[PDB]
Amino acid sequence: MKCLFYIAGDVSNYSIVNYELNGQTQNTFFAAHALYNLFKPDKVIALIPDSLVKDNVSDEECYKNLVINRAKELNFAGMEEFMNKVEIRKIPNVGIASAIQCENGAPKKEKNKEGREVLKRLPYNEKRSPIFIFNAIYAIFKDEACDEYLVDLTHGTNVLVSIGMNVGALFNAKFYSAPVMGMPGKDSIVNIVELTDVVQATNDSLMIRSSIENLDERYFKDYSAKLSRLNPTIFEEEEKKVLTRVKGTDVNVVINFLWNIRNGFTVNAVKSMNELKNIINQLEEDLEKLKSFYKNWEEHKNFQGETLLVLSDLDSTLKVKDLLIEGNDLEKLNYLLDLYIKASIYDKALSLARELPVAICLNKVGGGMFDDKNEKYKHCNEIVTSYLRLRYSGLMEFRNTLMHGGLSTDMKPNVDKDGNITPGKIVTKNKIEDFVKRELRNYFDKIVNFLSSA
Amino acid sequence: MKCLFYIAGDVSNYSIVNYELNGQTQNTFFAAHALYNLFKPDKVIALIPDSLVKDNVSDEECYKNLVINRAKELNFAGMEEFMNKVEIRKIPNVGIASAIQCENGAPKKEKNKEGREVLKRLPYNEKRSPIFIFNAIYAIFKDEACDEYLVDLTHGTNVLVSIGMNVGALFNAKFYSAPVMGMPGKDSIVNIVELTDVVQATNDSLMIRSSIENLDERYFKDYSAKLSRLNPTIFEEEEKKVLTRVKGTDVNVVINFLWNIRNGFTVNAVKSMNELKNIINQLEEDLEKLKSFYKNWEEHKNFQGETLLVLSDLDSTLKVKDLLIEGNDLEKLNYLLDLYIKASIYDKALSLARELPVAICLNKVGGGMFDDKNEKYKHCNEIVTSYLRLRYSGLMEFRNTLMHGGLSTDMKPNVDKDGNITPGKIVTKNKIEDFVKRELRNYFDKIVNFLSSA
Known about the structure:
- The structure is cut from a larger assembly and holds two copies of chain A.
- Chain A has helices at 31-39, 59-73, 80-84, 130-142, 158-169, 196-213, 224-228, 239-247, 252-263, 266-271, 273-293, 311-317, 329-342, 346-364, 375-391, 393-403, 430-438, 440-452; strands at 5-6, 17-21, 24-28, 109-111, 116-118, 151-152, 175-176, 190-191, 414-415.
- Chain A is mainly alpha-helical.
- Chain A has a domain at 5-197: SSO1389-like (Rossmann fold, 3-Layer(aba) Sandwich), CATH 3.40.50.
- The N and C termini of chain A lie far apart (72 Å).
- The PDB classes it as rna binding protein.
């Protein structure tokens, strides 16, 4: 059960036009009607501000009559399923507006000495909060319990269409708008454009910039599906060069790189690092060409109407350059530790801060594998384990508490004879946080300090 | 270095008004000017669509002249120093628009048989994609490299203000718009509204809705700071009741509940669960009251200006009812395992799936502490460890592979005398993904089935 919302707006001076949205066309005089017939929602919500219509009992019924009083002035078709299958809900607006005056569900007409016009008593000055209007729009949206949504922004004030769009994004809502901008008389095909792709594409970039900042791959929205079907009809052989080098920027390598980081596979994360420097460098200068095309779009068409390829998806990916450091793999892990601390992922930070110091000696002792069989590891792990317990009683104690959690030999909870626990250990939280974010890198450095001269 | 952008718009018919934004007032004839004097940006960007101004050399030069040619008709003071501290950058628009025609950097004036006017040749009809306009505005915003941003939406088409707002959100921009909707003559104070809080309030809810779905607390934006200073001046002593139950809605316990889950303190997370069911009960039935207030906002205007308290922040918090199951703490963990799999965090899922069956025996065996001294644990852990290695060699095999990452006795990389790795135990993303998501719960249930009869 779909719903489709729109902003009301005064429609007494709109003309009959052919609105078109993706091949299908309809002949009405305002977008909501033309949009209604295209998608056939099970109900429709009108959302009429105070900027039009206020009488003494129920303003809502005057609006229903103003469209009927205008469907007469243009002798437009039946249109009666619309008026009898529409739920109208009044919403606030912000001051400087000028409001129509109705009387008892019919619009007040008055004399202008030349021709007959409607009585606008322009009394609308109201100082309202945007979050107040926002809260009011949210309440309408939640309490209709729809599935699909759909939203028309064609006909609202600059301030309301702004607030309405943000509410719609909370409901998997598709956005539609037809730029009226003047009266083209009867006919002159006006195009309705689908704003849904923009709203989706901006939340996509907030997740990505923060998926890199938090080292979490389940936030990186996978737009590789998009670049595959990225095919315009006619693009120049200069654009063919940069655009076909972007279709090939294999974003899978950066998702795999995060997944490997998130789950603790520091090896295939560090190993895979120098390969990303190739990918984001190619994407760095491939965006810079693309970034230059859209900068002076002037007569840079071909694109000029292509739905795929969003610069935001690319430029937000470039923040993954922050997770890349040039150098040798043992020092790449040393950087990866710091990444595990800026982002607040504590367990992996401790375990690497313990295991990396063993590898850094293995280098100093001429290399060896990480098995107990390998004697050079067996003995470096001893020095690390023993030096820790000598001066840094703290490090291992925390790491052991984060690896095995509550419900472990380490926390010692007390399962009672009835199915519920009585844990015997305070989760320390800030002592944990104060240690990892303020101490760990320093403890780690003093460990490697001692091991250098081996 | 601040910036302040605005949408251009036709200024030939704007009048002189008192723009007001937070006590301060400035006196100009279009909002973008008044905003500049208030915030003192280091530069200003014009952003001229094609919807106004088309001449033969530089469309950019006519707008700057069209603002001055209106700065004469109202003999407004400054403006000509302003006009050259404004860098004019041309942006696209979408069809049916009707454009002014300039000639040589001055607007073409014509004779209207009544009065002298500028020739609007209404030749603007364009089929552009919204993302195209978006990409071009993005290029403008990124390549200006500001610190603060600021954006005026007072003066743009509905389609541009939609697309423009989304660009601003990727640059931590504060949004401003003045509801024009008509000419209020000279004076009649027009108010600048700050749309910035709405945009923040909707991404804040996107992060909250996704913080619960992924069991990650560093996404939950904490609005409790807001509720502390949430106190209106005059609120009815019915609203005093419901609103005083919201300042006290202690959200700190739900963030702590997330942090405890992400880091593995499954005990004190589960222990704290039955306390949360009380909290979302109060916030659920307190949200329904608030939601009805904004449902009859028509005369409930003691909020008509309250900036704090966003419904989205509250209603999005309610999604945590999804992480709640009533019952005894042993079965609450049994649900917590499933949660560690819905959200794709495998290690905590595996490690809980191993230690929980040890607890589930202790109940059946009359309770005991989780320490090695306590023989009841000592012997239950033996049975599970032994039954696993008999029938489920896999569970522990992966669990041990996820707790300890690469750089461990379990993965066996080789660290060579030059500072490189070389992985040993190759386990792929999908072998892990397939095991936890498809098998673990079945392996886990059959363990408890066997242990039931103890």
